[PDB]
Design a protein around this ligand. Sequence first.
Ligand SMILES: C[C@@H]1O[C@H](NC(=O)c2ccc(-c3cccc(N)c3)o2)[C@@H](O)[C@H](O)[C@@H]1O
Ligand SMILES: C[C@@H]1O[C@H](NC(=O)c2ccc(-c3cccc(N)c3)o2)[C@@H](O)[C@H](O)[C@@H]1O
Ligand SMILES: C[C@@H]1O[C@H](NC(=O)c2ccc(-c3cccc(N)c3)o2)[C@@H](O)[C@H](O)[C@@H]1O
Lengths: 134, 134, 134
Amino acid sequence: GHMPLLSASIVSAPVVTSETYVDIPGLYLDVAKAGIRDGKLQVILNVPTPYATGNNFPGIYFAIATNQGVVADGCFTYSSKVPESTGRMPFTLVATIDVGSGVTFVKGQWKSVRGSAMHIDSYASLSAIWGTAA
Amino acid sequence: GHMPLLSASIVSAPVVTSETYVDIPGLYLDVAKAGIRDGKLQVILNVPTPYATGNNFPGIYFAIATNQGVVADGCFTYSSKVPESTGRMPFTLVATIDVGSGVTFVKGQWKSVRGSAMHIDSYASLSAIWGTAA
Amino acid sequence: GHMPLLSASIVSAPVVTSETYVDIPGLYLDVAKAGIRDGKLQVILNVPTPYATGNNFPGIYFAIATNQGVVADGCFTYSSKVPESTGRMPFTLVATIDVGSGVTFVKGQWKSVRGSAMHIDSYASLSAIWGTAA
Ligand SMILES: C[C@@H]1O[C@H](NC(=O)c2ccc(-c3cccc(N)c3)o2)[C@@H](O)[C@H](O)[C@@H]1O
Ligand SMILES: C[C@@H]1O[C@H](NC(=O)c2ccc(-c3cccc(N)c3)o2)[C@@H](O)[C@H](O)[C@@H]1O
Ligand SMILES: C[C@@H]1O[C@H](NC(=O)c2ccc(-c3cccc(N)c3)o2)[C@@H](O)[C@H](O)[C@@H]1O
């Protein structure tokens, strides 16, 4: 049937700040295009090597979003006001969505903690597994 | 057949300490209620934004448990005795269990590192995918 | 059919350094032995409790590799030159591979950041879910 495994990956994104959730370019799954219109998707946003730069306990919020908006989110933050070096802080987020609710796409998004610039310069992925009771 | 994707999520838990693994309230999957009695479950415990508070290199242990007890565990810990700010330390744990062994539920659990108080104040999830050779 | 859930887990590995990706002993899935020769695998490398020791902002790179080499990688790093204590830095990596390309096994691998010694002394896992459009 429909291939039940969906995936998108990137190796970089332009460095930005944001006060709201904004798409991480390339982390996008087109569910409607796949003909998936019911059942559930287990979605994993994997950003294994991010870093944040800023002047006030930097960090990044990440979200899984659909056309209906944010379904789940989280963040990492450093434990010092201005880290001596902004270390790489692995981040994974997992959510399960009902496609029947009207889901046509899934995206990874990010937002600044305290004005931080947001850095991806290596592999990151957005994955989904489709399940049905049919 | 049985919907092969199971999930539970929370956005907070009462702040506690524990010297043993104790349930994270709400992170519970009822496998027996779903009629799943054989095959395997790939379980993901996702706690993307925890923090620990304490006086001695704080942290949190997390576990995946069934009615048979802990199947897998791990922790995060800070790298300073008393962090200047207790940053958010994303945590994910993945284990695969044989349901045929007698599994009726799956839970997320947590335990203090060195007496730490344990904090969830945003999204966290427990997910499972059922697979069968049938 | 073929059990669509594959998993391997360990609780320790000999402490090593490496300037290249080297196998994490025991984190190995034999895909060919399972008779899986097409479709896709969603692979998760879960190293929830590693630490790195070294003198120069320590860390560990991790990779998912097949017989064809590295498909995805990432790292954690500390935010201090010589951490007061090398805290536990949870790490997860997720990649989806096309088995049809000629994949016969999947492995977790690791490599030093800046000469770090690499430590696993508790649970770690390598998991895969097989999906087919057939
Ligand atoms: C901001 C600093 O960034 C440094 N890493 C790199 O400059 C870099 C460039 C490419 C990569 C990288 C990562 C993960 C997988 C792969 N293959 C490559 O890392 C860190 O070592 C410091 O600790 C610190 O966080
Ligand atoms: C203990 C401190 O906690 C602060 N965060 C919050 O007080 C907070 C309240 C709600 C949330 C939060 C998280 C993740 C997703 C969402 N949507 C919301 O965070 C951090 O900024 C500091 O770095 C530090 O760890
Ligand atoms: C290097 C130091 O390592 C300490 N942990 C241990 O020595 C240890 C030995 C077994 C385990 C361990 C872990 C995860 C799950 C389980 N069950 C057991 O941890 C940390 O507390 C410090 O913060 C610090 O990182």
